[PDB]
Design a protein around this ligand. Structure first.
Ligand SMILES: CCC[C@H]1C(O)=CC(=O)O[C@@H]1CC(=O)/C(C)=C/C[C@H](O)[C@@H](C)C/C(C)=C/CO
Ligand SMILES: CCC[C@H]1C(O)=CC(=O)O[C@@H]1CC(=O)/C(C)=C/C[C@H](O)[C@@H](C)C/C(C)=C/CO
Lengths: 124, 121
């Protein structure tokens, strides 16, 4: 793959939890979009079940014609960091969920996946 | 300023609402971090009142001893895009709010400010 980031989204789309999990350094953290920190930190031992939960969610939204769309990573002037814009979309194009990941890489592995998403609310 | 993104944040830190607003192109959008879209689209005519609101909230959080930190913008390999990481911290340093802006520029103006934030507890 053209980067570990590409490898990660490849494996996840295919449901290869173990392949996606191995993209992360042993000292990596996945900083989820929601929690008390604010957000929520997952270490490498906890990321695999997160990936399991996400794979469960993925095929149930797919079972309703939803598509998850992950854009090409665009790197920062720091070549070990990149953003990935992403969305979850109904078959008719309606955006259900939209977010951005800030990746920090090290030694060809993911060191940080910092996840953000728009909060769907009645009013901003 | 080092860039129009720098000018926006410096103008805002200086309470210059009109100077910050002027950084946006007339066809710019501010894609807010919450709302039904998901998020919420504000056009250039609506952005000024958002800046007035944020100026007041900044003064309020400061009086409660909180600290807003906006990191140096980092451009992408596409030089018309950049991220700014930001956070809001309690006096001691506890983070109560954390986010990131993805900027799109055109001809020296802000065209898109796409705002994201963590959802708390
Ligand atoms: C269980 C809570 C963890 C989540 C979170 O809140 C923040 C976090 O970072 O990880 C979890 C969310 C997340 O990252 C991603 C990639 C979300 C994309 C999409 O919206 C999901 C519904 C999964 C999906 C169908 C992908 C395409 O098939
Ligand atoms: C109410 C106005 C709309 C907001 C919103 O809900 C979503 C949106 O995208 O823009 C507005 C939110 C916003 O930009 C930021 C950066 C909020 C962080 C923090 O809370 C402020 C107190 C930061 C600050 C000025 C610190 C002073 O040092």
């Amino acid at each position: 793959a053209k980067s570990v980031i590409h490898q990660f989204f490849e494996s996840g789309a295919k449901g290869d939890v173990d392949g996606a999990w191995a993209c992360f350094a042993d000292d990596a953290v996945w900083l989820a979009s929601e929690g008390p920190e604010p957000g929520r930190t997952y270490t490498k031992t906890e990321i695999r079940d997160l990936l399991v939960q996400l794979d469960e969610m993925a095929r149930t939204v797919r079972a309703q014609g939803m598509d998850g769309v992950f854009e090409e990573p665009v790197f920062l002037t720091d070549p070990d960091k990149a953003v990935v814009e992403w969305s979850l979309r109904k078959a008719d194009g309606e955006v259900v969920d939209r977010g951005i990941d800030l990746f920090t890489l090290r030694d060809g592995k993911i060191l940080v996946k910092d996840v953000f998403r728009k909060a769907k609310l009645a009013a901003a």
